[PDB]
Amino acid sequence: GPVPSRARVYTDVNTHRPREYWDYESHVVEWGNQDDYQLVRKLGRGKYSEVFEAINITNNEKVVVKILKPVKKKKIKREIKILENLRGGPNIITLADIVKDPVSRTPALVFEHVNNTDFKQLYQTLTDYDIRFYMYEILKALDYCHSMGIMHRDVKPHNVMIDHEHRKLRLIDWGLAEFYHPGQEYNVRVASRYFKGPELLVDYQMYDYSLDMWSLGCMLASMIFRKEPFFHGHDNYDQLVRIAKVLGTEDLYDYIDKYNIELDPRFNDILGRHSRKRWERFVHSENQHLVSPEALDFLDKLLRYDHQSRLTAREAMEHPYFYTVVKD
Numbered sequence: 001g002p003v004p005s006r007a008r009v010y011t012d013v014n015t016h017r018p019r020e021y022w023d024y025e026s027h028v029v030e031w032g033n034q035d036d037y038q039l040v041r042k043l044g045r046g047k048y049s050e051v052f053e054a055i056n057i058t059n060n061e062k063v064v065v066k067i068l069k070p071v072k073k074k075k076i077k078r079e080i081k082i083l084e085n086l087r088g089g090p091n092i093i094t095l096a097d098i099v100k101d102p103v104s105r106t107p108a109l110v111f112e113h114v115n116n117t118d119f120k121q122l123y124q125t126l127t128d129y130d131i132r133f134y135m136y137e138i139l140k141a142l143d144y145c146h147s148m149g150i151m152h153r154d155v156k157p158h159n160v161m162i163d164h165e166h167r168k169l170r171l172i173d174w175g176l177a178e179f180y181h182p183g184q185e186y187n188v189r190v191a192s193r194y195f196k197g198p199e200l201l202v203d204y205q206m207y208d209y210s211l212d213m214w215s216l217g218c219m220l221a222s223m224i225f226r227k228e229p230f231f232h233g234h235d236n237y238d239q240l241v242r243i244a245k246v247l248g249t250e251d252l253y254d255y256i257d258k259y260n261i262e263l264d265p266r267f268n269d270i271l272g273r274h275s276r277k278r279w280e281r282f283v284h285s286e287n288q289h290l291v292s293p294e295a296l297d298f299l300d301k302l303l304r305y306d307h308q309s310r311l312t313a314r315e316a317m318e319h320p321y322f323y324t325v326v327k328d
């Protein structure tokens with residue numbers, strides 16, 4: 001069978017936390033007053049919720065209301081419990097309230113409002129300094145949730161809110177987040193295609209926080225190289241091929257061999273043989289201002305097939321890539 005894997009950090013966080021911390025199914029939602037919030041405008045719709053700008057009329061503060069679509073009590077309470085567990089952590093979106101929506105017959109999560117800069121505008125305008133700064137801010141959030149026994153499992157630009165005016169960043173949409181329990185097999189149908197780690201694409205279920213670092217590397221690659229998304233697979237199979245055309249097939253085989261994973265035989269006539277490439281080949285005159293030796297080495301250390309070999313969030317924050325970023 002497949003060789004087991006454990007996280008190299010924060011392995012036992014949920015073991016030594018009380019059961020109530022990770023046993024989200026037993027969590028008792030403390031409900032607020034649904035009439036406290038008047039919806040102002042629909043901000044977006046996902047697979048699992050609709051998101052509204054709202055005013056909390058009790059404090060006259062803008063908030064954001066995420067009305068969940070119907071899905072099972074555990075997945076709702078999973079997100080709720082995780083948000084409550086992480087509340088107050090660096091750059092974690094703050095769950096302010098939970099109300100019962102009377103129309104959807106579902107929970108509505110109330111969050112702090114982040115005046116988020118247009119995502120298109122941000123990718124087009126972020127400087128080298130800004131990318132490092134915000135990467136560091138994301139790493140704070142990721143190290144925090146990882147240190148709290150939680151993997152986000154959906155790290156992607158759309159889940160990173162940035163109020164660029166205040167240089168404020170929030171990691172949002174914890175609806176896919178899970179508690180990391182050593183030895184637990186997880187759903188590999190997480191993350192958006194372009195940010196799925198190799199572990200997901202080869203159906204290796206015993207993954208951990210390091211999944212988020214792959215996704216984070218995909219974001220970093222897309223930013224410094226100005227290629228959105230960086231690994232642009234047409235489906236989950238082509239996604240792995242796109243990755244193998246950069247990281248090479250020999251290390252992909254090393255990876256699946258280490259974990260006694262077998263590729264889907266459908267890869268046999270689409271995968272091919274690929275050398276590992278040097279990151280410099282993605283540098284060109286339109287992205288070179290965003291590229292440095294530090295950027296490439298940092299990216300190189302995030303985008304490993306082997307989830308056990310990627311930088312942890314904490315190690316990532318040690319990287320010389322961030323030496324230039326002003327520390328508060």
Ligand SMILES: N#C/C(=C\c1ccc(O)c([N+](=O)[O-])c1)C(=O)Nc1nnc(Br)s1
Nearest residue numbers: 043051064093111114115116172173174
């Ligand atoms: N989407 C969104 C927003 C917040 C949010 C918070 C937690 C959360 O879990 C989710 N989620 O799941 O999609 C979303 C938001 O605040 N969007 C805005 N767009 N313009 C302005 Br101004 S705010």
